[PDB]
Amino acid sequence: LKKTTGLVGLAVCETPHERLKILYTKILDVLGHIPKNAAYRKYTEQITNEKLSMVKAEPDVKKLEERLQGGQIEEVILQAENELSLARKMIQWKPWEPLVEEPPASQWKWPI
Amino acid sequence: SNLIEVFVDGQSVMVEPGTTVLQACEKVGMQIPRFCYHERLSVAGNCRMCLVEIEKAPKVVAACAMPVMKGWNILTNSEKTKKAREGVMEFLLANHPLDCPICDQGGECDLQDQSMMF
Amino acid sequence: QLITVDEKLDITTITGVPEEHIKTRKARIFVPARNNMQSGVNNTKKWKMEFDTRERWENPLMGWASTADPLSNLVLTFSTKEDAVAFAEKNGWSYDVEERKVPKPKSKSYGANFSWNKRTRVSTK
Amino acid sequence: GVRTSPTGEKVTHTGQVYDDGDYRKVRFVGRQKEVNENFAIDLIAEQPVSQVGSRVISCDGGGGALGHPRVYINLDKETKTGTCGYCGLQFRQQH
Amino acid sequence: WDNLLAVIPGGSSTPLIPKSVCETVLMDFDALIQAQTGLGTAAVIVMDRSTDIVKAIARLIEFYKHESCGQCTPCREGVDWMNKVMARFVRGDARPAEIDSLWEISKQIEGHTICALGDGAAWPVQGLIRHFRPELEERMQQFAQQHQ
Amino acid sequence: ASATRFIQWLRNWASGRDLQAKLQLRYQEISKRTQPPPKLPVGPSHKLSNNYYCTRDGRREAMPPSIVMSSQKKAVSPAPPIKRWELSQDEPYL
Ligand code: SF4
Ligand code: FES
Ligand SMILES: [Zn+2]
């Protein structure tokens, strides 16, 4: 086990593989409540499964960080927490719905 | 009725017969470089600063004096057009005096401004 | 949720502009005339808003041109006449609008210089 | 040259001088009015005209890249000299 | 014949041609176009090896400079510009980098003027540069050494 | 530079360094205040031919932005993940 993650305020995780399986599984369950054809569901399920496959395949924490390519394993866990929080918020926002409103005629015309 | 179709950089524009190449370009918002041409004077065609390439035509035409023809595509930003302007500007500045600091035209001079742009 | 506000937009009390420089001023909405010293037409493309000219006097010390008019240099650019008018309405300024002056299309003919029987024939090239 | 107005105030090379009754001359009381005494109009007129044997001559002000932009002067008129529009040196054609 | 240096086959406007081309070239419009010249008026000006080829062409540019009507910019200013450069090439008072500059200048005159006089003043220069570049570069080298 | 031997030893001992070899006051090792004139080089555009400005005009090659989507498959990231940094062989630990 590492002595430190090197980032102030990010504590070393005793059981990183177990924590990552729990978080990715929670993300996938939350994604199951998003509409099937929503792009957020399709892309996030795709990337979440890929990371989950690496977590199962590779038991060595040093080697797992090499595959995931997302920093320290504690940075990966934090990112999975962030994604899980985002998924819950996306359900209430529902950004897969059509555009709320077109902008005025030349709102984005530069130069004027 | 009698409008003929020409193209400016591939954009179609309908003009009356007798419209010049220079006037056809104005209808799409482009201003051809000029010195001798003035819309209220008779056409001269001597400065040669308005030379412009007609697509698939070997020779550049004086846009101010050349009537357009049906189907012509006027390449107003072509490599041939741009190199014609550079040559003409170079001849204009060969004998011109280094006077801009003492010349009243400085700052509102078409020679200065078209040298900068073309 | 949205609300219905059935008034003309008016922001003069939330712009910070002093009373004097809202109702005594006269904005002019126009397209600038081509500088007749040059043939380029690129400065005649946009609409401008400018205010009425006020006094400029000579500084006693150096003779510089002094001003008490905060809007002397204020010039605004607009894409269309409607945009300029809408900006003046909501700011409370009295304005005068002037139609854009586009040059007339001319009939040009190089061959007219050599007419057999017309006066357009030139005597020199 | 530096004249003195009837009041006694020096006239500058731009012709400036406060007239009588102009209060602004109070600013020089107990002090002085800064006037450059080397009038360029007088100094340039002391340079002799240069005789050259050609219709056209060039002037850069002297000193190469330390002078002014190089201009070419026409000397065809014999009723006058050719003057440099930058430095005011005069040229005349030698017969 | 072995003394032949160059021939102008159709008046001053047509580019010169060296002796080798003159060995077999036929005198007609199409054949002389293939030899990168032209029939022109069919005035054959013959120059032998005692000729100063650079000076001979330079006098031709001086002719066109004296004849340009002055109406249009590329010939009014360009031909006179070429005349000054050619005059310097006669003495070698120039650098080799100016040869390709002279070639570029003539191409700016050619095809950009009102009439064909501008073309007629650019072709003689192109013919000289095309066939006698070593003569030009050899005169510049000679001038440079006498001025050290 | 004018300090005596004893003072040089005293202040060298006090600081723990050899101060005389790296004096903070400048003496004769600095450049002369009169220098020979330069002759600066010229840039690549100083050519008499093959130098048409239209072929070396950076401003006129700038284009308006490319519209990807206007309101008129594998997931992606803005770029590949950043490669991890390596410890200095020069001195990993200060
Ligand atoms: S090219 Fe023809 S029209 Fe133009 S200046 Fe020369 S002679 Fe005159
Ligand atoms: S504007 Fe002068 S040739 Fe056309
Ligand atoms: Zn001068």
Side-chain angles (χ1 to χ4, degrees):
Chain A
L1 190 82
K2 56 171 74 173
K3 301 288 179 264
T4 181
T5 69
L7 296 162
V8 177
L10 189 60
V12 170
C13 192
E14 294 293 328
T15 68
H17 285 83
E18 292 53 44
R19 184 50 175 170
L20 278 180
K21 276 168 181 134
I22 294 155
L23 285 162
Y24 292 146
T25 303
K26 278 193 210 288
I27 290 160
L28 290 167
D29 305 358
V30 175
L31 289 171
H33 297 273
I34 293 162
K36 184 69 167 52
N37 57 348
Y40 180 73
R41 173 169 183 175
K42 294 190 290 202
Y43 287 132
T44 314
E45 281 189 333
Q46 189 201 132
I47 67 188
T48 296
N49 277 304
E50 290 172 343
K51 292 163 186 233
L52 187 43
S53 307
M54 298 168 175
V55 172
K56 292 181 181 180
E58 182 47 50
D60 172 322
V61 163
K62 299 297 293 296
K63 293 176 181 250
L64 175 52
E65 286 161 355
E66 176 73 359
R67 295 268 295 288
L68 290 161
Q69 217 185 327
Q72 313 271 304
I73 203 67
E74 292 81 0
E75 295 187 278
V76 186
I77 283 148
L78 178 58
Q79 184 43 44
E81 276 149 356
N82 295 325
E83 189 82 84
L84 174 57
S85 181
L86 178 64
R88 295 172 190 284
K89 281 149 152 165
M90 296 283 270
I91 279 153
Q92 300 303 306
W93 290 330
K94 300 192 202 309
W96 42 87
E97 290 173 332
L99 182 60
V100 297
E101 200 173 16
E102 307 276 354
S106 66
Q107 182 65 51
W108 302 116
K109 182 196 160 167
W110 190 258
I112 64 170
Chain B
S1 172
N2 45 312
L3 305 198
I4 64 188
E5 186 188 54
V6 304
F7 306 92
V8 176
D9 304 315
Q11 174 189 0
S12 160
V13 64
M14 290 296 198
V15 306
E16 274 283 278
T19 301
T20 71
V21 173
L22 177 136
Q23 288 174 308
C25 296
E26 316 189 309
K27 286 180 82 74
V28 305
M30 183 177 176
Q31 195 176 17
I32 295 278
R34 70 207 56 188
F35 281 105
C36 78
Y37 174 74
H38 196 276
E39 71 182 309
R40 307 188 189 282
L41 301 175
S42 69
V43 180
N46 64 66
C47 84
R48 315 307 287 175
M49 192 59 194
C50 72
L51 293 174
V52 75
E53 158 175 33
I54 304 300
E55 197 183 24
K56 66 178 72 168
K59 186 182 278 286
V60 296
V61 304
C64 65
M66 178 56 82
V68 294
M69 293 177 71
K70 182 65 133 163
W72 268 11
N73 197 5
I74 303 148
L75 307 183
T76 64
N77 200 46
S78 179
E79 188 98 344
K80 184 184 282 186
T81 303
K82 285 186 294 208
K83 291 184 72 173
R85 291 157 182 179
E86 276 191 49
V88 166
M89 188 51 65
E90 164 154 51
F91 293 130
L92 286 165
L93 298 185
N95 291 293
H96 203 69
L98 270 74
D99 271 24
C100 302
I102 57 174
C103 177
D104 274 325
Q105 201 76 23
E108 64 189 348
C109 178
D110 276 330
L111 191 61
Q112 282 190 321
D113 277 18
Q114 292 177 103
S115 165
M116 291 305 289
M117 293 324 186
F118 309 109
Chain C
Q1 195 62 50
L2 303 159
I3 58 162
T4 297
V5 172
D6 214 33
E7 313 281 316
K8 84 180 286 292
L9 184 54
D10 202 69
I11 57 157
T12 80
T13 56
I14 52 154
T15 56
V17 182
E19 175 188 35
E20 178 197 359
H21 299 112
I22 290 165
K23 47 198 91 173
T24 65
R25 309 315 304 260
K26 173 61 68 151
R28 199 171 75 100
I29 294 155
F30 68 111
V31 179
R34 178 179 60 87
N35 177 7
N36 189 179
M37 294 300 265
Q38 288 187 273
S39 286
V41 302
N42 216 39
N43 287 330
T44 73
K45 301 294 201 205
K46 302 280 145 203
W47 288 82
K48 293 293 175 302
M49 176 178 307
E50 84 194 356
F51 291 82
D52 52 310
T53 286
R54 302 211 161 171
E55 173 177 32
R56 304 176 163 104
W57 71 92
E58 262 164 11
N59 178 243
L61 185 62
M62 288 297 281
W64 295 330
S66 308
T67 191
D69 173 16
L71 302 187
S72 51
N73 297 311
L74 167 57
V75 182
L76 297 159
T77 306
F78 294 91
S79 306
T80 69
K81 188 213 282 166
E82 279 55 67
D83 297 329
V85 171
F87 194 83
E89 294 293 329
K90 76 172 161 180
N91 270 281
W93 291 313
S94 166
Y95 56 91
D96 264 9
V97 185
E98 296 169 26
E99 294 324 282
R100 181 194 278 274
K101 278 195 183 49
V102 70
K104 205 156 73 56
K106 278 76 172 177
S107 180
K108 306 301 291 166
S109 164
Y110 181 70
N113 297 345
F114 320 106
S115 175
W116 154 243
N117 55 359
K118 299 284 164 292
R119 292 162 179 165
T120 63
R121 160 168 273 273
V122 309
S123 49
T124 191
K125 300 208 307 310
Chain D
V2 186
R3 262 180 317 103
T4 61
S5 175
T7 300
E9 190 177 313
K10 291 185 287 189
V11 188
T12 68
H13 82 283
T14 70
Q16 195 272 334
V17 74
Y18 290 130
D19 65 46
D20 291 331
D22 199 330
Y23 84 88
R24 288 179 289 170
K25 73 176 65 172
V26 69
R27 75 188 57 192
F28 303 133
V29 176
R31 297 189 286 206
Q32 56 94 42
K33 179 185 181 184
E34 182 93 356
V35 180
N36 188 271
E37 307 274 289
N38 287 311
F39 281 29
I41 187 160
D42 297 296
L43 298 170
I44 194 57
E46 304 175 29
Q47 301 308 301
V49 182
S50 166
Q51 319 296 121
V52 306
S54 48
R55 299 221 279 117
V56 175
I57 199 63
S58 75
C59 187
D60 67 346
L66 295 171
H68 60 74
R70 190 214 297 137
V71 291
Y72 297 83
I73 298 166
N74 175 276
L75 310 173
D76 285 349
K77 290 164 176 174
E78 304 272 316
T79 61
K80 56 184 288 295
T81 60
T83 301
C84 181
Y86 279 100
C87 71
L89 284 175
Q90 289 167 258
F91 304 86
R92 205 184 269 114
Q93 185 167 8
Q94 183 62 255
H95 62 253
Chain E
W1 184 253
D2 301 299
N3 207 30
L4 179 58
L5 177 63
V7 175
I8 292 153
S12 68
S13 294
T14 57
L16 68 86
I17 51 172
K19 165 169 173 266
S20 61
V21 179
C22 292
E23 288 277 354
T24 71
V25 67
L26 304 199
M27 285 304 274
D28 69 12
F29 298 99
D30 303 322
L32 286 163
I33 284 160
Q34 321 313 332
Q36 299 160 280
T37 174
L39 182 58
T41 60
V44 177
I45 310 150
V46 179
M47 284 156 280
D48 69 349
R49 281 195 294 196
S50 78
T51 308
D52 181 348
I53 195 62
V54 180
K55 184 184 138 169
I57 299 306
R59 186 66 189 75
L60 281 183
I61 308 310
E62 177 174 317
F63 165 86
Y64 289 109
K65 181 252 186 177
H66 292 331
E67 298 300 332
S68 165
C69 66
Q71 179 171 212
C72 78
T73 315
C75 171
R76 179 182 63 253
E77 310 296 340
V79 171
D80 183 40
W81 186 354
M82 290 203 302
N83 180 73
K84 286 179 188 180
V85 172
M86 277 299 301
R88 277 193 297 111
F89 282 20
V90 171
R91 319 190 313 270
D93 174 42
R95 302 142 45 205
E98 272 171 293
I99 287 160
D100 282 307
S101 178
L102 179 57
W103 182 273
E104 288 210 323
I105 286 151
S106 63
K107 288 278 165 202
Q108 286 168 187
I109 303 163
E110 195 191 339
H112 302 83
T113 54
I114 289 170
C115 77
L117 190 144
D119 306 331
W123 293 331
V125 171
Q126 280 159 20
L128 180 77
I129 289 165
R130 175 194 298 112
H131 292 300
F132 290 95
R133 183 141 187 173
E135 181 64 72
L136 292 163
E137 284 170 338
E138 190 276 331
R139 212 162 294 192
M140 289 163 194
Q141 188 274 331
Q142 183 62 255
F143 176 94
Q145 296 294 321
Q146 327 199 350
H147 290 65
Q148 292 163 35
Chain F
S2 70
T4 62
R5 179 268 180 176
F6 177 80
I7 290 302
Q8 283 179 54
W9 170 89
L10 167 66
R11 74 194 188 190
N12 275 6
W13 174 82
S15 65
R17 312 295 197 293
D18 167 32
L19 302 174
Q20 208 64 10
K22 295 181 169 176
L23 284 174
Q24 64 183 357
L25 307 172
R26 292 163 295 162
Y27 286 96
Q28 301 281 70
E29 64 277 352
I30 53 149
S31 295
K32 299 292 180 68
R33 309 298 285 186
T34 288
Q35 293 285 317
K39 182 175 174 66
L40 302 184
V42 302
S45 299
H46 282 68
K47 316 196 290 179
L48 302 183
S49 47
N50 197 33
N51 203 41
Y52 277 94
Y53 184 80
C54 57
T55 76
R56 56 185 172 83
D57 185 352
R59 292 189 305 164
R60 269 50 171 281
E61 300 188 32
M63 294 298 103
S66 303
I67 312 291
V68 160
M69 183 278 288
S70 176
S71 64
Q72 64 84 30
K73 187 161 174 203
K74 298 296 289 183
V76 287
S77 56
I82 190 167
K83 183 174 154 293
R84 203 192 55 237
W85 286 6
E86 277 152 20
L87 263 173
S88 168
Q89 287 69 240
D90 201 33
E91 181 148 290
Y93 296 85
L94 174 49

